[PDB]
Design a binder for this molecule. Structure first.
Ligand SMILES: N[C@H](COP(=O)(O)O)Cc1c[nH]cn1
Ligand SMILES: N[C@H](CO)Cc1c[nH]c[nH+]1
Ligand SMILES: [Zn+2]
Ligand SMILES: [Zn+2]
Ligand SMILES: [Zn+2]
Ligand SMILES: [Zn+2]
Lengths: 255, 246
């Protein structure tokens, strides 16, 4: 089945990314040469496309690095080989491959694979969400039971993205009200929500390649993921993930 | 002295790993800090007990000559929620100047250490140690910054200034607590800053940052761990960072 293949693709991407991460010349003195990450990002995409072309010939593929059909029909794989390239290039291990199958534009299978954090998160529709640490036996994920905002832990990415001068004030406001604030960034915030270690994750601009695997993992863990406008799923352009209980309050404070 | 510190961390790692694993992670309100206070006390007691170096003093749970300073669990608010960003900080101070430091985060499978004049190192999953050096980033507009949370920056003007700083740098995260500083020492980040931080929380970090070639000061530019706040950088960026915050 489809989950088994997605997990296999992540195993393969992990081999490709691990070696390249290790190979990086980490000496730096200005904004980093994104070049070797673009190389690695392209290499892993090409390899996933080649495997997909063989082993599920029918299904479409959309790639962040190379491209795919712009519309969203039938079975379609969506792949971001390295989410967190800006960490990758600095030697910061917060980066992952995101591999997701969409059925008529609805995420049905998700894998987030972060070999340099020795972690994987995955989910298939109606089958639950899971995580492994250092390849050890998988644990079923569930969101937290935190019902009050004043008791909630939030993780974000960076303050700059919250562009609108009012939305920034509103978001800064939200950080003042919650119990705990960090910014683990990118995919990590959302996986932590799914794990129930964090209660809220928010990003003001985020693409479908970056959200697709997360949407299914969050949901199968019991959580909710929507745009800032409350539209469910990965196509919103922004994402707020919560344990569900907190969702409407979070969205209300942000609007 | 260094060998002893690394040994104390090995022992603290055994105590902390088991207790982190043992935690009941179901939660619906602010977390019961109780099991972390228990673990914190347990590790401190066991370090106090560990004996060899009987002459030396010991100072978070329970500044003359040889004094050990120990925070057994930095990042207790992570520990209690199941977030693996937490560590033991073990440091030796000589007349109030850090000479030996170990940061051990077994849940991240990482350790960072330094002794005066001997350099700074890190291990990942017990694999062969690497010598650390800070980055060579000279321009603020190209710098990566990591902090803790925004609320700590209390003063309405200092907050605006800090928010400003985040707007100007190339990359902003908040990995939090000890992690930000260790990343500076690794050269993976160029600036780390916290507006309220205790000597127990900075002592191991001061030596690690400096042996890696960086600088660590208060927000008022007082060098070392006693300043009540900390800014660590690769050195090159230090004065510009302090100036923008003052
Ligand atoms: N920093 C990201 C650019 O690189 P990448 O897509 O190759 O990781 C943008 C991003 C993705 N998720 C969160 N932010
Ligand atoms: N924050 C991650 C939580 O799994 C671990 C980490 C961050 N940086 C390095 N390691
Ligand atoms: Zn990418
Ligand atoms: Zn991406
Ligand atoms: Zn502390
Ligand atoms: Zn701390």
């Amino acid at each position: 089945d489809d989950l088994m293949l997605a997990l296999a693709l992540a195993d393969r991407a992990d081999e490709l990314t691990r070696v390249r991460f290790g190979a990086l010349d980490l000496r730096i003195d200005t904004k980093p040469d994104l070049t070797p990450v673009t190389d690695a990002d392209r290499a892993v995409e090409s390899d996933v496309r080649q495997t997909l072309g063989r082993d599920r010939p029918g299904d479409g593929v959309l790639g962040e690095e190379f491209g795919g059909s712009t519309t969203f029909t039938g079975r379609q794989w969506i792949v971001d080989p390295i989410d967190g390239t800006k960490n990758f290039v600095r030697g910061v291990p917060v980066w992952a491959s995101l591999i997701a199958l969409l059925e008529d534009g609805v995420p049905s299978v998700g894998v987030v694979s972060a070999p340099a954090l020795q972690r994987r998160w995955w989910a298939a529709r109606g089958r639950g969400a899971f995580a492994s640490v250092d390849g050890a036996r998988p644990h079923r994920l569930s969101v937290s039971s935190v019902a009050e905002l004043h008791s909630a832990s939030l993780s974000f990415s960076s303050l700059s993205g919250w562009a609108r001068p009012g939305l920034r004030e509103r978001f800064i406001g939200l950080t003042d009200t919650v119990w705990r604030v960090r910014a683990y960034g990118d995919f990590l915030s959302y996986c932590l929500v799914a794990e129930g270690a964090v209660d809220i994750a928010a990003e003001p601009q985020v693409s479908v390649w970056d959200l697709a695997a997360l949407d299914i993992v969050v949901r199968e863990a019991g959580g909710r993921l929507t745009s800032l406008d409350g539209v469910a799923g990965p196509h919103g352009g922004s994402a707020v993930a919560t344990n569900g209980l907190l969702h409407d309050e979070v969205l209300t404070r942000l609007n």
